[PDB]
Structures are given as structure tokens and as C-alpha cells.
Amino acid sequence: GYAIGGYIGISDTTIVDTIAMKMYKETSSAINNVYLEVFREDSTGALTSVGSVDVSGQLTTASDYVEATLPAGVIVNAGERYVVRMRNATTVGNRVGV
Amino acid sequence: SAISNVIDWFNSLLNFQDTTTSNQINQQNFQIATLASGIKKQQWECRYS
Amino acid sequence: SAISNVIDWFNSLLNFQDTTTSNQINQQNFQIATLASGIKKQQWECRYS
Amino acid sequence: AKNLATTDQSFSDDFNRSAMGGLWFLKSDTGTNQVGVSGGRAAFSGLTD
């Protein structure tokens, strides 16, 4: 139930296809409902969701990169800001270490 | 028929003329826009773009 | 009058010809210069440009 | 890339857009008005001398 995210700058405009974060799981118990999502920051500073993906299946106990493909491409432009949020709304209760 | 052919050729030349002028204007504007925009500094390097 | 009009049209076509050639040369040279120049590494990333 | 053949830069501008833009450093003795593009041509902005 605790979500953490950071702002990402855009250097050159392109089409995004995947997002990555460095995280792992503390215990070896089964986990689910771990989501990585992307938010665009508007002019007013509000965050709008433009994509999300479940990454709980491919997580590993060892600290390793997690790369997940978005459902569809999200065009980005230089000058705007984006946030990659990890949600971790799991049901079993195993914590996530980022 | 000779005058009709001259009419057709002049119309074709006018079409080519306007297309070339429009293409030149569009190309130069594309150059200027690409030069104006482009790479911007990321968020961690600076606050400003 | 017909020959005078032909003279005027030929002069206009020559003007368009030279302007288009000059514009083509300028556009190509500008693109080549922009490709040659551009982003350079900052002072902290490396010593050389 | 210590040494490299310096390509002779060339630039062009048709002045065929909405505003002068960031590609031109503007300085005037008027105080507020600068070179303004209108009708696809650069010109003087304002009625000041």
C-alpha cells in the first residue's frame, strides 16, 4: 500500500516502450499486485496516468533490474516531466525493497 | 492543337513552380524549427530545460 | 506585344531559376553545417569538446 | 576528437514565420520594441524613432 516514485526528465523526444526500476523482494514468499506506472506532469503540475504494468511475476529476491513493457507506446517530448511510480498493493504482505 | 499544347505545358510549369516554392518554404522552416528545438537538459542535470 | 511578353516571361523564369539554385545551395550548405556542428560535451563530462 | 576538419558553417533564414524566435539576439535603441517579422519579412516594430 506504499507507493514511491521519482521525476524523470526528457532530453530528446521519442516513443517510450518500457520502464525499469531497481528493486527486489525481501522474503521468498509469493507476491502479486506490484505495479510500475508512468505519470505525465501537466502544466499545472498534476500527474496523469498514461500507462501501467504488473511486474510481480518477474521479480527476484536478489537485487536485480526490473524491465517491463508498457501496454502501448506513450509519445514524450523534451521539456516535460514524467514520474515512474511503484505501487506495491500486494495481498500476501511481502515487502518490496527499492 | 499547338496552342492547346502550349496552354497545357504552361499550366504544368505553373504547377511545378508553386510546388517548388512551397517545398522550399517548408524545407527552410523545417531547418529553422529543428535548429531551434532539439536536445534539452534532463531533470537531474538542471531544474531548467 | 507578344514578343515583349515572351521577353518578360523569360526574364521571370531566369529570375526564378537563379533564386531556386541559390536557395538549393544555401539549404544544402546550411544542413551540412548544422550536421557538422551541434552538441558538444560540457566541461565536467570531459576535458575536450 | 582533439583535432578535426572545421567545416565552414553557413546559415540561412527566410524570415517566413510568426515571431522572430530565439535564433536572433535582438538589441534596439527603442527600449521595448525589436525587429519583428510580418508578412514573411523582417521589419521595424512600433512607431518609435
Task: Name the CA radius of gyration of chain B, rounded.
Answer: 22
CA distance A33 to A19: 17
Residue from A7, A8, A11 whose CB has the most chain B CBs within 10 Å, to mutate: A11
Chains touching B (at least 3 CB pairs under 8 A) are: A, C, D
> What experiment produced this structure?
cryo-EM
Question: What are the C-alpha distances in Å from D38 to residues B24, C30, D34, D44?
Answer: 19, 24, 12, 9
Q: Which three cell numbers stand for residue A54?
A: 504488473
**Closest Cα in chain A to B38:** A12
Calpha distance C27→C1 (Å, rounded): 39
Of the candidates C16, C27, C34, the beta carbon closest to that of B27 is on C27
Residues whose CB is less than 8 angstroms from the CB of residue A17 and which lie 6 or more positions away in sequence, other chains included = A69, A70, A73
Q: Is the CB of residue A37 less than 8 Å from the CB of residue A27?
A: no
Torsion of CA D16, D17, D19, D20, to 10 degrees: -40
B20, B28, B35: residue with CB nearest C27 = B28
Q: How far is CA A80 from CA A10, A29, A45, A69, B40, in A?
A: 6, 39, 10, 21, 10
The verdict on A81 touching B (C-beta cutoff 8 Å) is: yes
Handedness of CA B28, B29, B35, B39 (dihedral sign): negative
Chain B / chain D CB contacts < 8 angstroms? 19
B26 touches chain C (CB under 8 A): no
Mind telling me how many Å the CA of B10 is from chain D's nearest CA?
28
In three-state secondary structure terms, B6 is: helix
Q: How far is B21 from chain C (nearest CA, A)?
A: 8
Nearest chain C Cα distance for residue B24, angstroms: 8
Q: Which of D1, D2, D10 sits opposite C29 (nearest CB)?
A: D10
CB atoms within 10 A of CB A68: 17
